[PDB]
Amino acid sequence: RAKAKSRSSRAGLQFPVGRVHRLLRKGNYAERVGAGAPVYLAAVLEYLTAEILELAGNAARDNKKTRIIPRHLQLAIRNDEELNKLLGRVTIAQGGVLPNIQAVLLPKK
Amino acid sequence: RDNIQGITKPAIRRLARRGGVKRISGLIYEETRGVLKVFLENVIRDAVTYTEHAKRKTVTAMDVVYALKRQGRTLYGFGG
Amino acid sequence: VLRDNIQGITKPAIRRLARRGGVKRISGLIYEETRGVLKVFLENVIRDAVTYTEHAKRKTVTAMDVVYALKRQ
Amino acid sequence: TLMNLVMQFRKVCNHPDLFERADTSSPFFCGHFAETGSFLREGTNVALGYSTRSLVEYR
Amino acid sequence: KPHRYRPGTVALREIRRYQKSTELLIRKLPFQRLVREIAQDFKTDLRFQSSAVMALQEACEAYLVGLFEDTNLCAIHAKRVTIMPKDIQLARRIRGER
Amino acid sequence: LIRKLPFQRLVREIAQDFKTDLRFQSSAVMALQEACEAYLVGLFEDTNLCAIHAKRVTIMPKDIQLARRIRGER
Amino acid sequence: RKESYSVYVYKVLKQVHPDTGISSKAMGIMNSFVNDIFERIAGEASRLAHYNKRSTITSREIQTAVRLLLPGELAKHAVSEGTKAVTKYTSSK
DNA sequence: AGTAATCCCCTTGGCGGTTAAAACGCGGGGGACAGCGCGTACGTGCGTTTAAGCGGTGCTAGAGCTTGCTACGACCAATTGAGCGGCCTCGGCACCGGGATTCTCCA
DNA sequence: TGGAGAATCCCGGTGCCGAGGCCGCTCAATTGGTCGTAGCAAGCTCTAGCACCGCTTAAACGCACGTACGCGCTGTCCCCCGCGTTTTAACCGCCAAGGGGATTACTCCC
């Protein structure tokens, strides 16, 4: 009985290939679940989590904050064209909005 | 009861400021109340439908999130 | 090879599509705007219809692949 | 069904109002009236019309 | 004579305050009662978790803020600075709610 | 409403950006055309409201752009 | 006993920004996001298997799902990350 | 095995106050809206030509279906440590105050 | 251009509560072997997709030219904004209740 090394560690991922395998089964998405399909998915979940948190860590830094807040997630997600297209029907709790004033509303000379 | 009038004029003003609106016709306030309750009457009947079908006599945050997600307005932060 | 076939949706065709949408009068700048609309639409439908075709390892795009692409809009 | 009845007997041994409470009462009323269908939708202000009507109904 | 900012100056100072903020803009207790009222029409003797009425408020406010943006663009599409009921009515018809 | 042959050629021309030497079933092109006509007709309806709302009987490019912006297409 | 992505999100946060924290409410957004995109991908992978008349969710199902659900450059980067993760799971066990 | 008392917990309801947010009044400004003149830009009709549409002929790519098996996932039992619930603390972020800088408006 | 003063910013100080790490343990992920089968592969069938020709005429284009309508301009007036006053109800805290769901007792019935 050999020493166990997690499917995540073998794949090289921080995200859990085990849970992604279970949840692909418990959700009854299909009758059979391949061995590598939880790995591919666990990698994409990890990748997109890095995209969000990279841009949000920049935005937190811009606000002189050490710590990410749903505000910084909203700012990151709306500023980036592709995250904004990926999340174009998602409401983020306590995100607020982008600062955006139509040019016609600004004061006259 | 009419707590729809508890959605005050200053509150409808504040929401329009966040929406970036400079000048607001006084007729807007009753239009906005009519629009708000039509939204709530769709989300709560679904949130009730979940608690009813899931056989509980209290409404949980996730009942709302399923209701919203099925309405098409995915909310992140309250489960989901 | 094919090029500029977006000018195959003629201005009378854009008139017919606008009149059936109830439009009375049409600014002469609409005709190029309509093409920038139709092409951006038809690209991202066909992008999926072809993705459903190279998945399942086939070479004709089928009406079902179109239907699955539209259903993704 | 004694698993029910021993308690139901014991209830009246203690006091009959536990079994079915005595209340303000009147003769059988042999007439039509409009009964309330919903308590919830009646609200706080309501008009009590005189609905009392005979079931013997000569046409 | 008192100092007085011109009409529309503080409307801009306010836009730059409610944008650039995260707070909920509807008072909490009034929204609870409106929610309970609407709930009674569907099932009486329901109850709500605190996080359920919060989730429901957050979704409402985000719906109204996002709606106002679309009416601001309708108002500004006509020559106007002022939003009117006909702008809400246009926005919701273009969206397909109406 | 759109002529069939120049719509076929538009479909082929677009598709070649994704995969060379695709084939299209005849029913697949008609399903694309019928969706495009229904899409353009349905957008012109929404632009006509944008013109009429601005008191203009004549639709203008900013009416397309307002319709799409509110539909969330942009 | 509930289950959360918080530990894995922290282990991504400390890679991209080893100095940076995250608040519980923001971690909430990350859980909802991972749940929502996991479910969106699995939903297309399900439909792709069903359309093909196949009983099996393979990595090929999840590849085609990722190329449907993501914008063009996120799609390609995700397809790259996914294809190497499976390649290193292969050549192991 | 059933039905009722006992007890936890968590939601709803009421009371008091305090103060911060909603309502109310009033001057004026400036933005909404009707009105006018022009002019240019879109709808109309005609003659032109262009190619979309139809009926018809020819080929081969490849969609679709069957056969055969073995590689890959479903299922189970034993092993263990990765991940969750509970407790702790200290440092990040807010909140305040005060003086410094900015912006706005009438002169 | 200046100025006055209000509104927005910044700098340092205070404190509180929640973020980040530690601890115990369970139970869910992993190791090992089994067995069924499905979908990967090789092979045949013939559908239907693509290519070309020739004809027809309806559909598309270029142009003349009139007038209907988009747009900048002018005037007004009304109604929505900025600010001081008045008042009410949202917020907070603390106590009550009730209800319901899980547990435990005791009898009758099988």
Short mmCIF file of N, CA and C (backbone and C1' of nucleotides) in Angstrom, two decimals, chain I residues 14-77:
data_model
loop_
_atom_site.label_atom_id
_atom_site.label_comp_id
_atom_site.label_asym_id
_atom_site.label_seq_id
_atom_site.Cartn_x
_atom_site.Cartn_y
_atom_site.Cartn_z
P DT I 14 -2.96 58.33 20.18
"O5'" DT I 14 -4.34 57.56 19.91
"C5'" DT I 14 -5.61 58.17 20.17
"C4'" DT I 14 -6.74 57.26 19.76
"C3'" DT I 14 -6.74 55.86 20.44
"O3'" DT I 14 -7.95 55.67 21.20
"C1'" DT I 14 -7.09 55.69 18.09
P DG I 15 -8.14 54.41 22.16
"O5'" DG I 15 -8.85 53.31 21.24
"C5'" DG I 15 -10.22 53.45 20.81
"C4'" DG I 15 -10.64 52.26 19.99
"C3'" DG I 15 -10.37 50.88 20.63
"O3'" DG I 15 -11.39 49.96 20.27
"C1'" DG I 15 -9.27 51.02 18.56
P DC I 16 -12.80 49.98 21.04
"O5'" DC I 16 -13.61 48.95 20.15
"C5'" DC I 16 -14.04 49.30 18.83
"C4'" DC I 16 -13.77 48.21 17.83
"C3'" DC I 16 -13.83 46.76 18.37
"O3'" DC I 16 -14.42 45.90 17.39
"C1'" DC I 16 -11.76 47.14 17.36
P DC I 17 -16.02 45.84 17.24
"O5'" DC I 17 -16.13 44.87 16.00
"C5'" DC I 17 -15.59 45.23 14.73
"C4'" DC I 17 -14.72 44.14 14.14
"C3'" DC I 17 -15.07 42.69 14.58
"O3'" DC I 17 -14.95 41.81 13.47
"C1'" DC I 17 -12.82 43.15 15.01
P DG I 18 -16.23 41.47 12.56
"O5'" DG I 18 -15.53 41.23 11.17
"C5'" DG I 18 -14.69 42.23 10.59
"C4'" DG I 18 -13.32 41.67 10.30
"C3'" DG I 18 -13.30 40.25 9.69
"O3'" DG I 18 -12.26 40.13 8.72
"C1'" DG I 18 -12.02 40.28 11.65
P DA I 19 -12.47 39.21 7.42
"O5'" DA I 19 -10.96 38.98 7.01
"C5'" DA I 19 -10.07 40.08 6.85
"C4'" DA I 19 -8.67 39.69 7.24
"C3'" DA I 19 -8.07 38.51 6.47
"O3'" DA I 19 -6.72 38.80 6.06
"C1'" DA I 19 -8.04 38.05 8.81
P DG I 20 -5.91 37.82 5.09
"O5'" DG I 20 -5.07 36.90 6.09
"C5'" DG I 20 -4.01 37.43 6.90
"C4'" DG I 20 -3.47 36.38 7.84
"C3'" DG I 20 -3.03 35.05 7.17
"O3'" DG I 20 -1.65 34.76 7.46
"C1'" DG I 20 -4.41 34.65 9.06
P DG I 21 -0.99 33.36 7.09
"O5'" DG I 21 -1.02 32.53 8.46
"C5'" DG I 21 -0.33 32.99 9.63
"C4'" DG I 21 -0.60 32.08 10.80
"C3'" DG I 21 -0.17 30.59 10.60
"O3'" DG I 21 0.70 30.17 11.67
"C1'" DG I 21 -2.39 30.73 11.41
P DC I 22 1.18 28.65 11.80
"O5'" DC I 22 0.30 28.05 12.99
"C5'" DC I 22 0.38 28.57 14.33
"C4'" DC I 22 -0.59 27.86 15.23
"C3'" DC I 22 -0.40 26.34 15.35
"O3'" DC I 22 -0.30 25.95 16.74
"C1'" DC I 22 -2.66 26.84 14.76
P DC I 23 0.14 24.47 17.16
"O5'" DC I 23 -1.25 23.67 17.31
"C5'" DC I 23 -2.16 23.95 18.38
"C4'" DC I 23 -3.44 23.18 18.20
"C3'" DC I 23 -3.28 21.64 18.04
"O3'" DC I 23 -3.72 20.95 19.22
"C1'" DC I 23 -4.92 22.59 16.55
P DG I 24 -3.62 19.36 19.35
"O5'" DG I 24 -5.06 18.84 18.88
"C5'" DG I 24 -6.25 19.12 19.65
"C4'" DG I 24 -7.46 18.54 18.97
"C3'" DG I 24 -7.43 17.02 18.71
"O3'" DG I 24 -8.72 16.44 18.95
"C1'" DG I 24 -7.70 18.17 16.66
P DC I 25 -8.98 14.88 18.73
"O5'" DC I 25 -9.67 14.79 17.28
"C5'" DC I 25 -11.01 15.26 17.06
"C4'" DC I 25 -11.47 14.89 15.67
"C3'" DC I 25 -11.34 13.41 15.30
"O3'" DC I 25 -12.40 13.01 14.44
"C1'" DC I 25 -10.09 14.70 13.79
P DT I 26 -13.78 12.49 15.05
"O5'" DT I 26 -14.66 12.44 13.73
"C5'" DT I 26 -15.08 13.64 13.09
"C4'" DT I 26 -14.98 13.55 11.58
"C3'" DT I 26 -15.27 12.16 10.97
"O3'" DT I 26 -15.94 12.31 9.72
"C1'" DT I 26 -13.13 12.86 10.34
P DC I 27 -17.50 12.68 9.68
"O5'" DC I 27 -17.61 13.22 8.20
"C5'" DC I 27 -16.56 13.99 7.62
"C4'" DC I 27 -15.72 13.19 6.65
"C3'" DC I 27 -16.46 11.98 5.95
"O3'" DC I 27 -16.49 12.18 4.54
"C1'" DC I 27 -14.30 11.40 6.71
P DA I 28 -17.67 13.03 3.87
"O5'" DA I 28 -16.86 13.75 2.71
"C5'" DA I 28 -15.73 14.57 3.01
"C4'" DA I 28 -14.50 14.15 2.24
"C3'" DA I 28 -14.74 13.70 0.78
"O3'" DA I 28 -13.73 14.24 -0.06
"C1'" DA I 28 -13.66 11.98 1.99
P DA I 29 -13.83 14.06 -1.65
"O5'" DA I 29 -12.35 13.62 -1.97
"C5'" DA I 29 -11.24 14.40 -1.54
"C4'" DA I 29 -9.97 13.60 -1.59
"C3'" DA I 29 -9.63 12.98 -2.95
"O3'" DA I 29 -8.23 13.13 -3.24
"C1'" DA I 29 -9.79 11.26 -1.30
P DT I 30 -7.58 12.51 -4.57
"O5'" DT I 30 -6.86 11.17 -4.07
"C5'" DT I 30 -5.74 11.21 -3.17
"C4'" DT I 30 -5.35 9.82 -2.75
"C3'" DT I 30 -4.96 8.86 -3.90
"O3'" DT I 30 -3.62 8.37 -3.72
"C1'" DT I 30 -6.52 7.83 -2.39
P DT I 31 -2.89 7.50 -4.85
"O5'" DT I 31 -2.98 6.00 -4.29
"C5'" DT I 31 -2.30 5.60 -3.09
"C4'" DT I 31 -2.52 4.14 -2.76
"C3'" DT I 31 -2.21 3.16 -3.89
"O3'" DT I 31 -1.50 2.02 -3.36
"C1'" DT I 31 -4.48 2.91 -3.22
P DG I 32 -0.78 0.97 -4.32
"O5'" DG I 32 -1.90 -0.13 -4.62
"C5'" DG I 32 -2.25 -1.13 -3.65
"C4'" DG I 32 -3.42 -1.95 -4.13
"C3'" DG I 32 -3.28 -2.56 -5.55
"O3'" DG I 32 -3.04 -3.97 -5.47
"C1'" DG I 32 -5.48 -1.70 -5.07
P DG I 33 -2.81 -4.85 -6.79
"O5'" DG I 33 -4.27 -5.37 -7.18
"C5'" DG I 33 -5.04 -6.19 -6.28
"C4'" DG I 33 -6.46 -6.33 -6.77
"C3'" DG I 33 -6.62 -6.89 -8.22
"O3'" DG I 33 -7.17 -8.22 -8.19
"C1'" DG I 33 -8.10 -5.05 -7.74
P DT I 34 -7.53 -9.00 -9.53
"O5'" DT I 34 -9.08 -8.68 -9.77
"C5'" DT I 34 -10.08 -9.07 -8.81
"C4'" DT I 34 -11.41 -8.45 -9.16
"C3'" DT I 34 -11.98 -8.83 -10.55
"O3'" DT I 34 -13.24 -9.51 -10.41
"C1'" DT I 34 -12.11 -6.47 -10.16
P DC I 35 -13.87 -10.35 -11.62
"O5'" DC I 35 -14.68 -9.27 -12.48
"C5'" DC I 35 -15.90 -8.67 -11.99
"C4'" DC I 35 -16.51 -7.78 -13.05
"C3'" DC I 35 -16.73 -8.43 -14.42
"O3'" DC I 35 -17.88 -7.89 -15.05
"C1'" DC I 35 -15.26 -6.60 -14.65
P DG I 36 -18.96 -8.86 -15.74
"O5'" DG I 36 -19.77 -7.81 -16.59
"C5'" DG I 36 -20.39 -6.68 -15.97
"C4'" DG I 36 -20.22 -5.44 -16.82
"C3'" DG I 36 -20.54 -5.62 -18.32
"O3'" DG I 36 -21.18 -4.45 -18.84
"C1'" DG I 36 -18.34 -4.82 -18.06
P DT I 37 -22.01 -4.53 -20.21
"O5'" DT I 37 -22.59 -3.06 -20.25
"C5'" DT I 37 -21.85 -1.96 -19.72
"C4'" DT I 37 -20.74 -1.50 -20.64
"C3'" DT I 37 -21.04 -1.62 -22.18
"O3'" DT I 37 -21.09 -0.33 -22.76
"C1'" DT I 37 -18.85 -2.36 -21.61
P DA I 38 -22.40 0.59 -22.59
"O5'" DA I 38 -21.79 2.00 -22.97
"C5'" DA I 38 -20.66 2.52 -22.27
"C4'" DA I 38 -19.53 2.88 -23.21
"C3'" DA I 38 -19.95 3.46 -24.57
"O3'" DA I 38 -18.96 4.38 -25.03
"C1'" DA I 38 -18.74 1.49 -24.91
P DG I 39 -19.13 5.95 -24.76
"O5'" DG I 39 -17.85 6.49 -25.52
"C5'" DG I 39 -16.56 5.96 -25.24
"C4'" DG I 39 -15.83 5.52 -26.49
"C3'" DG I 39 -16.18 6.29 -27.78
"O3'" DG I 39 -15.02 6.44 -28.58
"C1'" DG I 39 -16.58 4.01 -28.10
P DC I 40 -13.94 7.58 -28.25
"O5'" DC I 40 -12.65 6.93 -28.90
"C5'" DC I 40 -11.86 5.99 -28.17
"C4'" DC I 40 -11.28 4.95 -29.10
"C3'" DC I 40 -10.82 5.47 -30.48
"O3'" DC I 40 -9.43 5.15 -30.71
"C1'" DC I 40 -12.20 3.53 -30.70
P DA I 41 -8.69 5.56 -32.06
"O5'" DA I 41 -9.01 4.37 -33.07
"C5'" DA I 41 -8.31 3.11 -33.00
"C4'" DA I 41 -8.92 2.11 -33.95
"C3'" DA I 41 -8.84 2.47 -35.46
"O3'" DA I 41 -7.89 1.62 -36.12
"C1'" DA I 41 -10.97 1.54 -34.81
P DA I 42 -7.57 1.79 -37.69
"O5'" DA I 42 -8.56 0.76 -38.40
"C5'" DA I 42 -8.47 -0.66 -38.17
"C4'" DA I 42 -9.48 -1.40 -39.01
"C3'" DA I 42 -9.44 -1.10 -40.52
"O3'" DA I 42 -9.58 -2.32 -41.27
"C1'" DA I 42 -11.60 -0.64 -39.67
P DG I 43 -9.56 -2.32 -42.87
"O5'" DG I 43 -11.10 -2.20 -43.29
"C5'" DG I 43 -12.01 -3.29 -43.12
"C4'" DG I 43 -13.41 -2.88 -43.49
"C3'" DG I 43 -13.58 -2.27 -44.90
"O3'" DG I 43 -14.18 -3.23 -45.80
"C1'" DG I 43 -14.89 -1.16 -43.20
P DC I 44 -14.41 -2.90 -47.34
"O5'" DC I 44 -15.95 -2.48 -47.44
"C5'" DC I 44 -17.00 -3.42 -47.16
"C4'" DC I 44 -18.33 -2.71 -47.04
"C3'" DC I 44 -18.83 -2.01 -48.33
"O3'" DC I 44 -20.08 -2.56 -48.75
"C1'" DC I 44 -19.01 -0.58 -46.41
P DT I 45 -20.77 -2.11 -50.13
"O5'" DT I 45 -21.84 -1.01 -49.69
"C5'" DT I 45 -22.94 -1.33 -48.82
"C4'" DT I 45 -23.66 -0.07 -48.40
"C3'" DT I 45 -24.25 0.79 -49.54
"O3'" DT I 45 -25.62 1.11 -49.28
"C1'" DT I 45 -22.88 2.13 -48.14
P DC I 46 -26.66 1.38 -50.46
"O5'" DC I 46 -26.58 2.97 -50.69
"C5'" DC I 46 -27.23 3.89 -49.80
"C4'" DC I 46 -26.92 5.32 -50.13
"C3'" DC I 46 -27.10 5.72 -51.61
"O3'" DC I 46 -27.62 7.04 -51.70
"C1'" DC I 46 -24.92 6.21 -50.92
P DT I 47 -29.17 7.32 -51.42
"O5'" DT I 47 -29.06 8.52 -50.39
"C5'" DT I 47 -28.97 8.27 -48.99
"C4'" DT I 47 -28.28 9.41 -48.29
"C3'" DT I 47 -28.77 10.81 -48.66
"O3'" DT I 47 -28.83 11.65 -47.50
"C1'" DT I 47 -26.47 10.60 -49.24
P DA I 48 -29.58 13.07 -47.53
"O5'" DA I 48 -28.48 14.08 -48.11
"C5'" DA I 48 -27.34 14.49 -47.32
"C4'" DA I 48 -26.43 15.38 -48.12
"C3'" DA I 48 -27.13 16.54 -48.88
"O3'" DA I 48 -26.33 17.71 -48.84
"C1'" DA I 48 -25.87 15.23 -50.38
P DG I 49 -26.27 18.59 -47.50
"O5'" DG I 49 -24.87 19.30 -47.70
"C5'" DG I 49 -23.65 18.61 -47.39
"C4'" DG I 49 -22.61 18.88 -48.44
"C3'" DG I 49 -22.58 20.33 -49.01
"O3'" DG I 49 -21.31 20.95 -48.77
"C1'" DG I 49 -22.47 18.70 -50.74
P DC I 50 -21.03 22.47 -49.19
"O5'" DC I 50 -20.32 22.36 -50.62
"C5'" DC I 50 -19.04 21.72 -50.78
"C4'" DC I 50 -18.70 21.57 -52.23
"C3'" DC I 50 -18.61 22.89 -53.05
"O3'" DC I 50 -17.26 23.11 -53.50
"C1'" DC I 50 -19.80 21.18 -54.22
P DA I 51 -16.85 24.45 -54.28
"O5'" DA I 51 -17.10 24.10 -55.82
"C5'" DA I 51 -16.29 23.13 -56.51
"C4'" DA I 51 -16.84 22.87 -57.89
"C3'" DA I 51 -17.09 24.13 -58.76
"O3'" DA I 51 -16.03 24.31 -59.71
"C1'" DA I 51 -18.79 22.42 -58.99
P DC I 52 -15.90 25.64 -60.59
"O5'" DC I 52 -16.87 25.39 -61.84
"C5'" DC I 52 -16.62 24.33 -62.78
"C4'" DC I 52 -17.82 24.12 -63.67
"C3'" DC I 52 -18.32 25.35 -64.42
"O3'" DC I 52 -17.70 25.44 -65.71
"C1'" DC I 52 -20.09 23.87 -63.63
P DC I 53 -17.96 26.68 -66.68
"O5'" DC I 53 -19.38 26.37 -67.35
"C5'" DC I 53 -19.59 25.20 -68.17
"C4'" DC I 53 -21.04 25.07 -68.55
"C3'" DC I 53 -21.64 26.27 -69.32
"O3'" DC I 53 -21.86 25.93 -70.70
"C1'" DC I 53 -23.12 25.38 -67.62
P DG I 54 -22.08 27.06 -71.81
"O5'" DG I 54 -23.62 27.46 -71.66
"C5'" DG I 54 -24.68 26.57 -72.06
"C4'" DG I 54 -26.02 27.11 -71.63
"C3'" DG I 54 -26.35 28.55 -72.11
"O3'" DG I 54 -27.40 28.52 -73.10
"C1'" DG I 54 -26.97 28.16 -69.83
P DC I 55 -27.94 29.86 -73.79
"O5'" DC I 55 -29.21 30.27 -72.91
"C5'" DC I 55 -30.34 29.39 -72.77
"C4'" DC I 55 -31.26 29.88 -71.68
"C3'" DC I 55 -31.89 31.27 -71.90
"O3'" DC I 55 -33.27 31.14 -72.30
"C1'" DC I 55 -31.18 30.88 -69.62
P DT I 56 -34.14 32.42 -72.70
"O5'" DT I 56 -34.70 32.97 -71.30
"C5'" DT I 56 -35.57 32.17 -70.48
"C4'" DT I 56 -35.81 32.85 -69.15
"C3'" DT I 56 -36.41 34.29 -69.23
"O3'" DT I 56 -37.71 34.33 -68.61
"C1'" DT I 56 -34.59 34.16 -67.68
P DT I 57 -38.69 35.58 -68.80
"O5'" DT I 57 -38.32 36.56 -67.59
"C5'" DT I 57 -38.65 36.22 -66.23
"C4'" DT I 57 -38.14 37.28 -65.28
"C3'" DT I 57 -38.52 38.74 -65.63
"O3'" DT I 57 -38.82 39.47 -64.45
"C1'" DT I 57 -36.18 38.54 -65.46
P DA I 58 -40.35 39.65 -63.99
"O5'" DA I 58 -40.17 39.52 -62.42
"C5'" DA I 58 -39.59 38.35 -61.85
"C4'" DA I 58 -38.40 38.71 -60.99
"C3'" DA I 58 -38.61 39.90 -60.02
"O3'" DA I 58 -38.08 39.59 -58.72
"C1'" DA I 58 -36.71 40.26 -61.37
P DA I 59 -38.24 40.60 -57.49
"O5'" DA I 59 -36.76 41.16 -57.25
"C5'" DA I 59 -35.69 40.30 -56.83
"C4'" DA I 59 -34.37 41.03 -56.90
"C3'" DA I 59 -34.24 42.28 -56.00
"O3'" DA I 59 -32.99 42.26 -55.28
"C1'" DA I 59 -33.71 42.82 -58.25
P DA I 60 -32.52 43.51 -54.40
"O5'" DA I 60 -31.41 44.22 -55.30
"C5'" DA I 60 -30.23 43.53 -55.74
"C4'" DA I 60 -29.28 44.47 -56.44
"C3'" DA I 60 -28.92 45.75 -55.67
"O3'" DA I 60 -27.53 46.02 -55.76
"C1'" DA I 60 -29.79 46.30 -57.79
P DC I 61 -26.91 47.33 -55.06
"O5'" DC I 61 -26.22 48.01 -56.31
"C5'" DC I 61 -26.93 48.17 -57.53
"C4'" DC I 61 -26.17 49.08 -58.48
"C3'" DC I 61 -25.76 50.41 -57.88
"O3'" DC I 61 -24.59 50.91 -58.55
"C1'" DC I 61 -27.60 50.72 -59.39
P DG I 62 -23.89 52.28 -58.10
"O5'" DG I 62 -24.38 53.34 -59.19
"C5'" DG I 62 -23.99 53.25 -60.57
"C4'" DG I 62 -24.60 54.36 -61.38
"C3'" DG I 62 -24.36 55.79 -60.84
"O3'" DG I 62 -24.02 56.68 -61.91
"C1'" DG I 62 -26.68 55.40 -61.07
P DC I 63 -23.75 58.24 -61.65
"O5'" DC I 63 -25.18 58.93 -61.88
"C5'" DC I 63 -25.79 58.97 -63.18
"C4'" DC I 63 -27.14 59.62 -63.11
"C3'" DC I 63 -27.17 61.06 -62.51
"O3'" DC I 63 -27.47 62.04 -63.52
"C1'" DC I 63 -28.99 59.69 -61.77
P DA I 64 -27.66 63.58 -63.17
"O5'" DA I 64 -29.25 63.78 -63.13
"C5'" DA I 64 -30.06 63.55 -64.29
"C4'" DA I 64 -31.51 63.88 -64.00
"C3'" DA I 64 -31.78 65.29 -63.47
"O3'" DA I 64 -32.97 65.84 -64.06
"C1'" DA I 64 -32.54 63.68 -61.89
P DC I 65 -33.44 67.33 -63.75
"O5'" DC I 65 -34.16 67.23 -62.33
"C5'" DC I 65 -35.54 66.85 -62.21
"C4'" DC I 65 -36.05 66.97 -60.79
"C3'" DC I 65 -35.77 68.34 -60.08
"O3'" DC I 65 -36.96 68.80 -59.44
"C1'" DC I 65 -35.00 66.59 -58.74
P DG I 66 -37.57 70.23 -59.81
"O5'" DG I 66 -38.91 70.18 -58.98
"C5'" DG I 66 -39.73 69.01 -58.99
"C4'" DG I 66 -39.78 68.38 -57.62
"C3'" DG I 66 -40.22 69.32 -56.46
"O3'" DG I 66 -41.53 68.97 -56.00
"C1'" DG I 66 -38.39 67.88 -55.88
P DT I 67 -42.38 69.95 -55.06
"O5'" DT I 67 -42.01 69.49 -53.57
"C5'" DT I 67 -42.43 68.21 -53.06
"C4'" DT I 67 -41.95 68.03 -51.64
"C3'" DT I 67 -42.31 69.16 -50.66
"O3'" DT I 67 -42.57 68.64 -49.36
"C1'" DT I 67 -39.97 68.90 -50.73
P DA I 68 -44.02 68.09 -48.99
"O5'" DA I 68 -43.63 66.97 -47.94
"C5'" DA I 68 -42.98 65.77 -48.36
"C4'" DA I 68 -41.91 65.37 -47.38
"C3'" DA I 68 -42.26 65.58 -45.90
"O3'" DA I 68 -41.80 64.46 -45.11
"C1'" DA I 68 -40.31 66.82 -46.44
P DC I 69 -41.93 64.46 -43.51
"O5'" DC I 69 -40.48 64.88 -43.00
"C5'" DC I 69 -39.33 64.06 -43.26
"C4'" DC I 69 -38.09 64.69 -42.68
"C3'" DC I 69 -38.13 64.96 -41.16
"O3'" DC I 69 -36.84 64.76 -40.58
"C1'" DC I 69 -37.73 66.96 -42.30
P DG I 70 -36.70 64.09 -39.13
"O5'" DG I 70 -35.18 64.41 -38.83
"C5'" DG I 70 -34.17 64.09 -39.79
"C4'" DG I 70 -33.09 65.13 -39.78
"C3'" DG I 70 -32.49 65.45 -38.40
"O3'" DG I 70 -31.05 65.54 -38.48
"C1'" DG I 70 -33.36 67.44 -39.38
P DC I 71 -30.16 65.76 -37.18
"O5'" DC I 71 -30.09 67.35 -37.01
"C5'" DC I 71 -29.38 68.17 -37.96
"C4'" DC I 71 -29.49 69.64 -37.64
"C3'" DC I 71 -29.15 70.04 -36.17
"O3'" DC I 71 -27.99 70.86 -36.15
"C1'" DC I 71 -31.12 71.12 -36.97
P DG I 72 -27.23 71.15 -34.76
"O5'" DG I 72 -27.26 72.73 -34.76
"C5'" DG I 72 -26.80 73.47 -35.88
"C4'" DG I 72 -27.43 74.84 -35.90
"C3'" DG I 72 -27.20 75.70 -34.64
"O3'" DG I 72 -26.84 77.05 -35.00
"C1'" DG I 72 -29.51 75.52 -35.09
P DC I 73 -26.57 78.16 -33.88
"O5'" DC I 73 -27.96 78.93 -33.75
"C5'" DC I 73 -28.50 79.72 -34.83
"C4'" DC I 73 -29.85 80.27 -34.47
"C3'" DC I 73 -29.92 81.10 -33.15
"O3'" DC I 73 -30.09 82.49 -33.44
"C1'" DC I 73 -31.79 79.61 -33.43
P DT I 74 -30.00 83.60 -32.29
"O5'" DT I 74 -31.49 83.69 -31.71
"C5'" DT I 74 -32.58 84.18 -32.50
"C4'" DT I 74 -33.89 84.00 -31.78
"C3'" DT I 74 -33.97 84.65 -30.37
"O3'" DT I 74 -34.85 85.78 -30.37
"C1'" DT I 74 -34.95 82.44 -30.45
P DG I 75 -35.04 86.70 -29.08
"O5'" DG I 75 -36.23 86.01 -28.27
"C5'" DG I 75 -37.57 85.98 -28.78
"C4'" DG I 75 -38.47 85.18 -27.87
"C3'" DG I 75 -38.48 85.62 -26.38
"O3'" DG I 75 -39.82 85.91 -25.94
"C1'" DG I 75 -38.15 83.28 -26.56
P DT I 76 -40.13 86.39 -24.45
"O5'" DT I 76 -40.66 85.07 -23.71
"C5'" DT I 76 -41.92 84.47 -24.05
"C4'" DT I 76 -42.24 83.27 -23.19
"C3'" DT I 76 -42.18 83.51 -21.68
"O3'" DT I 76 -43.13 82.67 -21.02
"C1'" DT I 76 -40.58 81.89 -22.27
P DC I 77 -44.60 83.21 -20.70
"O5'" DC I 77 -45.15 82.00 -19.85
"C5'" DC I 77 -44.97 80.65 -20.28
"C4'" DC I 77 -44.05 79.87 -19.37
"C3'" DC I 77 -44.17 80.20 -17.83
"O3'" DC I 77 -44.55 79.04 -17.12
"C1'" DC I 77 -41.93 80.07 -18.54
#
